[PDB]
Amino acid sequence: NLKPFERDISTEIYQAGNKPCNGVAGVNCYFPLQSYGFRPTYGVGHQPY
């Protein structure tokens, strides 16, 4: 969760295992930034606004 009226920083790389990554990449989880695949056939709700 985020607090109201404050800006979000997305830096931490999440790991599925609750043990810390400790600077080592893990499996089954990746960088939490999602690049939405934008096709012209997407619905208006799916379309970015």
């Binding site: 599925a16 089954n28 999602q34 619905g43």
Partner: protein, 595 residues
């Protein structure tokens, strides 16, 4: 540091990463089909290679589950999909050639040569056999066309059946089951649910139940054939006997679509067909799709989203670009749906696209659902809604609001018998084979059939139970349950089995609510909000609840109805009673090509 704590977040995160890769596979299908590039050909294969096998790597920690109750959501049902391990139980050396042997006969069947006398011209199974199906009145050609195909390859198909059953059953043994048929019942399996639980083996018995309503349909047609087909083929058609399967428009008798030639009502009255009378408003390729769009408001189905206008082609390419005649529509979601034919100015575009119409409108009803549960009440629901309204798309009396009817209604029977019998040809010829094939798989899966009664009984039961004749029986020299792609690749008919009768009930649901009595060809489905309200519930309910609850709601009766099947063609069946009341009913099992 709990593994359950890991899995709780991991499962939620996985469903979104999965969808991005799942969506890409269907998109490359058309792009590869129009220009083949190195990137284009590999897109679907490398996209889907991280779905099935890679699932196990994410699924390893799904076996640590506990009698924890916190899972009460439909999640438990996706959780079973998270518990799948795949074919990892199989050894690599025994599965190395399993893929090779599985598709070996598919190449031979596709690359098959039919021997012809004097080798006048090249011949092929499809469409060469269907092209000259009724070109001449030679029994010898009809026999030899299939006899040569069998004598080409069918003897060598026997070794295909050895490892197939063992490997198929080994999945059940690895999955703490004795039979794989009980593993196929995962969509029909529900547990820890009060009064809404169904058993996997119960769906075993319907084969006996479903054939009670099949014989009445076959009996009425046989009386009609008895009148007319003796003159054309008197050497192999006896009135008190089984209707021959080697004189119809089929190589194996599966689809009895080409029965109009042998069952034409009158040879002096041509059927009504208007083509030039319809073109007075400059009929073009766009006219058919415009009328299809107008069909939407007469069925209350909403118009499909922007995907209708870009992914679907509605005109000829006009260039050297080659298009796919086979429709390609997938439930990707997010507005990606297709209606694709070999789009030209053709009358077939009227019907084939309509077949996809039900396949379109259903998907947006549960597209918002996760891909793991992106389906209807059962597997046959997807293919059921696409054909129920297709019957109304060919009747022009239901097309009063089309503007092309000129409703000078003919004097009922006199005309309708000519047209309606054609539609009867759809409902008669596919029941027996679907009935007989589905039985064989279930008995062979458990293994209670002995080897001495596993091969010969395939033809022994055929003469007595269904009542059909074959051109050449196969005892221990041809493997009849090895000549089909479905058998050679471990496919079943559960896709066509549940909806076979339920489609008629679905179509009757649109009229029973509307308080319509009589034959179902004069039902008005226009501007009806009662039917749309009923149709908009279970379309969007999806798979969230157990299918048992939805089964009671959708049909309203726990048993099967036979009067709706006989009520759409009431004049057709009634008229044959007068001319056949003073005759022997049924067929005699004594006479058959057993010897």
């Amino acid at each position: 540091s709990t593994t359950e704590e890991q899995a709780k977040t991991f499962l939620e995160k996985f469903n979104h990463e999965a969808e991005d890769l799942s969506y890409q596979s269907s998109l490359a299908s058309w792009n590869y089909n129009t220009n083949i590039t190195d990137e284009n050909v590999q897109k679907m294969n490398e996209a889907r290679a991280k779905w099935s096998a890679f699932y196990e790597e994410q699924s390893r920690m799904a076996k640590t589950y506990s009698l924890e109750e916190i899972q009460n959501l439909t999640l438990k049902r996706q959780l079973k999909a998270l518990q799948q391990s795949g074919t990892s139980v199989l050894s690599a050396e025994k599965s190395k050639r399993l893929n090779t042997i599985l598709n070996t006969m598919s190449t031979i069947y596709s690359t098959g040569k039919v021997l012809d006398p004097n080798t006048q011209e090249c011949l092929a199974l499809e469409p060469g056999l269907d092209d000259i199906m009724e070109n001449s009145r030679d029994y010898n050609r009809r026999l030899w066309a299939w006899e040569g195909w069998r004598a080409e390859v069918g003897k060598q198909l026997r070794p295909l059946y050895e490892e197939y059953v063992v490997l198929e059953n080994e999945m059940a043994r690895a999955n703490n089951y004795e039979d794989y048929g009980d593993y196929w019942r995962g969509d029909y399996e529900v547990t820890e649910a009060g009064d809404y639980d169904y058993s996997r083996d119960q769906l075993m018995k319907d084969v006996e139940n479903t054939f009670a309503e099949i014989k009445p349909l076959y009996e009425q047609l046989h009386a009609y054939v008895r009148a007319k087909l003796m003159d054309t083929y008197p050497s192999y058609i006896s009135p008190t006997g089984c209707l021959p399967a080697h004189l119809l428009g089929d190589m194996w008798g599966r689809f009895w679509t080409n029965l109009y030639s042998l069952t034409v009502p009158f040879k002096h009255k041509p059927s009504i067909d208007v083509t030039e009378k319809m073109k007075n408003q400059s009929w073009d390729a766009e006219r058919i799709f415009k009328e299809a769009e107008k069909f939407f408001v007469s069925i209350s189905l909403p118009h499909m989203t922007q995907g209708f206008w870009d992914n679907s082609m509605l005109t000829e390419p006009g260039d050297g670009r080659k298009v796919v005649c086979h429709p390609t529509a997938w439930d990707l979601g997010k507005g990606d749906f297709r209606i694709k034919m070999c789009t030209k100015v053709t009358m077939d575009d009227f019907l084939t696209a309509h077949h996809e119409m039900g396949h379109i409108q259903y998907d947006m009803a549960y597209a918002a659902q996760p891909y793991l549960l992106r389906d209807g009440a059962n597997e046959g629901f997807h293919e059921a809604v696409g054909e129920i309204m297709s019957l109304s798309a060919a009747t022009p009396h239901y097309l009063k609001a089309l503007g092309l009817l000129e409703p000078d209604f003919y004097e009922d029977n006199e005309t309708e018998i000519n047209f309606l019998l054609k539609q009867a040809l759809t409902i008669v010829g596919t029941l027996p084979f679907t009935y007989m094939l589905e039985k064989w798989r279930w008995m062979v899966f458990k293994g209670e059939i002995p080897k001495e009664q596993w091969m010969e009984k395939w033809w022994e039961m055929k003469r007595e139970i269904v009542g059909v004749v074959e051109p050449l029986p196969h005892d221990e020299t041809y493997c009849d349950p090895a000549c089909l792609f479905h058998v050679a690749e471990d496919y079943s008919f559960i896709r066509y089995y549940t909806r076979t009768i339920y489609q008629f009930q679905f179509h009757e649901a649109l009229c029973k609510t509307a308080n319509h009595e009589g034959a179902l060809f004069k039902c008005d489905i226009s501007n009806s909000t009662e039917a749309g309200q009923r149709l908009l519930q279970m379309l969007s309910l999806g798979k969230s609840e157990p299918w048992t609850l939805a089964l009671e709601s959708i049909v309203g009766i726990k048993t099967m109805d036979v009067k709706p099947l006989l009520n759409y063609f009431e004049p057709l069946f009634t008229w044959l009673k007068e001319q056949n009341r003073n005759s022997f009913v049924g067929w005699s099992t004594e006479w058959t090509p057993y010897s």
